Design a protein around this ligand. Structure first.
Ligand SMILES: [Cl-]
Length: 247
């Protein structure tokens, strides 16, 4: 169990050296990296404080070196590390080579409404409207760092997730390093899904305690950067397409 960096090492060690950090922006809600034609994203908080000097240095470095930042206990740095990971795996050509299907022109909660009916479901993270989609059809528990009124604080994971038939976890858990314990707590679910724009589309994760990955393919590189930089007052989803791979 306490080979806990293993899932991080698996992601990093899959990146070929040839890939460089060609572009990097650290916005209020996401960090974003381009390596060639591929763009990856990682989530930030408005709490956490910027690091303009780290940002400058990573330009030019191997993507795999920058991905080492994912392990940082500084969460803005870790978000950059996840952006670098996702610049490799979520490159449209790389993703296609690893068996991800999508168009050059969906939602995991909607996809699994039938499957989770009458079952116990645990969700870690804040997902808009999720209560409306899932609460009427299943026994739903939502766990967050800073819970809204019907929701549980994160320490409740120890108590709740082992009882769950299905578990969904925000990709923010990669950044804050809660993911490995969450995976162990959920290991007897029928299925565990990692969800959000910062999810790596990395089938190696299916060997590391996950059965589904629900992320995001950027189709408009230039636009994705506009949004992350705050130059468009728009959600990141405008710049691409949701994509899901199952084990
Ligand atoms: Cl949260």
């Amino acid at each position: 169990f306490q080979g806990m960096w293993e899932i991080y090492d698996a992601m990093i060690n899959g990146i070929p050296e040839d890939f460089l950090v060609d572009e990097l922006v650290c916005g209020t809600t996401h960090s974003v990296i381009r390596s060639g034609n591929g763009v990856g994203l990682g989530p930030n908080r408005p709490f956490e404080t910027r690091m303009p000097m780290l940002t400058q240095n990573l330009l030019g470095l191997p993507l795999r070196v920058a991905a080492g930042c994912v392990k940082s206990w500084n969460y803005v740095e870790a978000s950059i590390g996840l952006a670098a990971i996702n610049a490799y795996y979520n490159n449209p050509q790389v993703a296609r080579e690893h068996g991800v299907i999508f168009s050059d022109a969906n939602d995991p909660f909607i996809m699994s409404q039938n499957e989770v009916k009458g079952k116990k479901v645990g969700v870690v993270g804040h997902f808009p409207h999720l209560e409306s989609l899932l609460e009427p059809i299943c026994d739903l528990s939502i766990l967050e760092w800073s819970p809204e009124e019907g929701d549980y604080p994160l320490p409740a994971s120890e108590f709740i997730l082992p009882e769950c038939d299905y578990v969904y976890i925000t990709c923010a858990s990669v950044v804050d390093k809660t993911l490995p314990r969450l995976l162990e707590l959920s290991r007897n679910a029928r299925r565990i899904t990692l969800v959000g724009p910062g999810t790596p589309l990395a089938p190696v994760l299916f060997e590391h305690g996950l059965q589904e990955l629900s992320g995001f393919m950027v189709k408009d590189n230039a636009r994705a950067f506009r949004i992350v930089a705050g130059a468009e007052k728009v959600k990141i989803y405008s710049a691409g397409q949701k994509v899901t791979i199952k084990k």
